Amino acid sequence: GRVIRNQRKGAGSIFTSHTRLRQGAAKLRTLDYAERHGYIRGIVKQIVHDSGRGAPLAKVVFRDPYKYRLREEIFIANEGVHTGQFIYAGKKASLNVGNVLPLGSVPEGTIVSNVEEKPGDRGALARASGNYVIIIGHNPDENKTRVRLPSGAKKVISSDARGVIGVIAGGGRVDKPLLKAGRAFHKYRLKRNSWPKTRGVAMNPVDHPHGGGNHQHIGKASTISRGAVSGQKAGLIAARRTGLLRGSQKTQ
Amino acid sequence: YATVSKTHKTVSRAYGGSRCANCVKERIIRAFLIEEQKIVKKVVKEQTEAAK
Amino acid sequence: AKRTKKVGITGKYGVRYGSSLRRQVKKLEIQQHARYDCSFCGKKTVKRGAAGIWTCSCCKKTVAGGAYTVSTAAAATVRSTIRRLREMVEA
Amino acid sequence: SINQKLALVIKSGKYTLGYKSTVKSLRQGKSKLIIIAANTPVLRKSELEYYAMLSKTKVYYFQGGNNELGTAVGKLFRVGVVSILEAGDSDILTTLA
């Protein structure tokens, strides 16, 4: 029986990211002295489009506290920030859109992007065009701060995790129908070779668990076990319910 | 540009062949003003620190 | 001379895709091609190019915005809150 | 209102509009008061502010954009600064301003 498609992807061949044009990797300034005792000013020098990315990047330059030289970063531009704006990054920094601040130093309800899970991880949560996280409370002893991620999951991280005030630019990108195959084609052209998708049900059995049969059909329950095994896992993996979600969602 | 005399690679004001002149005009005012305001900032909050 | 009764800019697509999809695109297209007021010098000269990048003909300021509109409801109301929350920490 | 005063001036006094020419006026010390629109950049502002102190000239920060300042002075274009040289009947020169 053939190795099925989702196993092929993992060896990375034709499947690696299409990376040539990307601006570089977006990430918060390293968490040095300045940024964790005081604050430090930069200028957003240019907000610029990263290929295969939802949202704009924002080239933002600073001085090097230790050497005479400019050091620049790549920020995912939060909506509203602009060329020439000044950015402040540090514990003791003000609470405006664009600035980056430790989740401790912002009151509940603040709305921040590109927030790191562990302090200094140069930023992990909420980076997609549109997304953000709201702080939903603090526990001063063992400095934690609780947030609600884009998914709706709540999660509770260190007060020193730096976030950046605001939401991520280019929002609403997904309200626009792609309309034709070509746009999806050109979309994926700059991400990775994952389009278009042949249904497992159009293949022969060599090819897929869904393969073959005299009509197209899945033949057995397509909800597959967590403890399935590579070559089995295709369909609705670990699915704990299934069917048209009738009723208002939204976690409590 | 290395087969061609220095005058071809500049104009005569500060930042010759480098910034756009209307852009140096700007540097200058800003330079001047931000520096002047520094004095006010120094001496205004200097006042505070005897009356507070 | 009124040129189309209703498909507007969406005429290029002609008959394909279906009235409803065309209807949706037409909206955000009108949104994204439109020419906006600039916060900074106050001339309506902010046009898009690249999603979320809005930049200004004269005075050359580029603003990061929504993917098809300059400002976004969410981002506005966030701006709004950050005001509110900031002020709580001046007085 | 402040607009109302300004509109009094504009219908009976003497005034110039725009950055280049209110500087002519500041140099001459002809200016009695200069009015500055919100969105006008800080360099421009701080520059006027300086010419302003030097000529010993009070300054009003119109809490409106250049678009409306143009409306204020009753002009179909925009203005980022006004300069009063002669106040008509209006009390802008010697009121709250």
Add this chain to the structure above:
Amino acid sequence: AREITDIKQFLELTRRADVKTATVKINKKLNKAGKPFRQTKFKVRGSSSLYTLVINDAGKAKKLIQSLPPTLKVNRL
């Protein structure tokens, strides 16, 4: 590569050390409208370029010719 007109400057080339050869060319040409006139070009082969000097005037040229360095190596025509 170089055309010259300072009859002073010229002479200073002809006595310029690196300058072995020279060469005079003569040209029938027409003047303004009708007539012809005898143009003469004075070519000095320097090391890095050939300097040429046109004397449109016949007289001006003949005199200029005896002026040529006795030790120069003129190619006549």
Add this chain to the structure above:
Amino acid sequence: AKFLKAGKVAVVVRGRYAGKKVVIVKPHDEGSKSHPFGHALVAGIERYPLKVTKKHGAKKVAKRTKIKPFIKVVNYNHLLPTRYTLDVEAFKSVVSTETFEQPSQREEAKKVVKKAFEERHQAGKNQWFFSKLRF
């Protein structure tokens, strides 16, 4: 006041001398037969004295503190008027309209102002002015 009067310090804002500090010595508020614009006659400092330090001994100090002047007919619209101000009297005369026209006269004026400007830099007098404006 018409603050471009007889002693005001300004910074050149356009052209070669752009960025350099000056002193108005005589203003021609409105007009010339030539210079159709409001313009000033400034003498100013082109090559500033280089910062001097304890380490600097004897002749280098003398060397470091040389000043190089210049004199300019200049449009008002190219000066940033300053709050500061420097006494002009020793080269009142030497900087005139008649100073310009003929180079020789210009060269002399600069000699004079140079002697003036250098004496003045020693012993504090008018500080700031002898210090470069960085931008």
Add this chain to the structure above:
RNA sequence: GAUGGGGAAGCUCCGUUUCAAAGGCCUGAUUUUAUGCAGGCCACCAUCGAAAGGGAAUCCGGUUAAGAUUCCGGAACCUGG
């Protein structure tokens, strides 16, 4: 795709600046003499990979059985010293 490394019985596999003590430039100090040391930097980390990508600089006339932007003639231009 070498390298300190890490796997592997092993042929070898992985890593590519990577948990590595990873190197050479400017000239001064020599006037025993040729290069030891006097500064100060730069921490940049191999290498291969395009006869369509990047890229110092040449043209015209003449010429052979068969070569020519390569010869000859003339007239240039670039790079280094």
Add this chain to the structure above:
RNA sequence: GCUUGUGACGGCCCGUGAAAAUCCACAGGAAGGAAUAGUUUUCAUGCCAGGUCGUACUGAUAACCGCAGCAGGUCUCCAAG
């Protein structure tokens, strides 16, 4: 007019359409440098040298691939009335 080069514009994008060598410039001002004579080779002129391998022809209904002088295949530029 045709080919082609180029310009100032304009349309499109959930697509916004390489890298590095290399070259220049500016900010800086270490430092060096004159009247009994100094500084200057980014102005001109002048001197020397420029290695190594490829360079013929075919490129196709006969010089390549299809057992072949095979009606197949096999990337391009110039283009008159």
Add this chain to the structure above:
RNA sequence: UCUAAGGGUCGGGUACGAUCAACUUAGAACUGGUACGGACAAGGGGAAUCUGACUGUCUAAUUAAAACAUAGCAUUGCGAUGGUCAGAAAGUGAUGUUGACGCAAU
């Protein structure tokens, strides 16, 4: 074989004149063995049923289709100490220059 309309370029005290250069388009006569896009070039049309929406894809060498794909719709997994996938192993790898407006699976 005629007719009409559509342009350039110059001087005028602080209404025009003079020439230069163009195939387009409409109108009117005459004329022929009624022929004339004279060769060349160049859509057959209509009314329905079944079926796939469309443009695109494939069985090189018997199947081009109604099959594949697509946009759209819906479901599932996952907050990185992670989901899915690679490897004999590992101080190993793909997604990942990535972060739910995301990646993965139907």
Add this chain to the structure above:
RNA sequence: UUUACUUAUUCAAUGAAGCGGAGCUGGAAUUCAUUUUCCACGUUCUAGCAUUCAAGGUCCCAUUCGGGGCUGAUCCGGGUU
């Protein structure tokens, strides 16, 4: 079994740059003897400029030109975080 430790083991970050402890100074504090303490302890109108062990102060070399110490910049532990 719970929960605590940090040196094994494990994860990240950085040209292992400012860690932990004490002291200075400000100042809230209310003084129940006098300090028991708690925080602070150089940067936010502006698309400028920020580099040569740093200027200053002070101490030496034996004054020449150069150059060095200390301070500026508080102590103590070498646990990079």
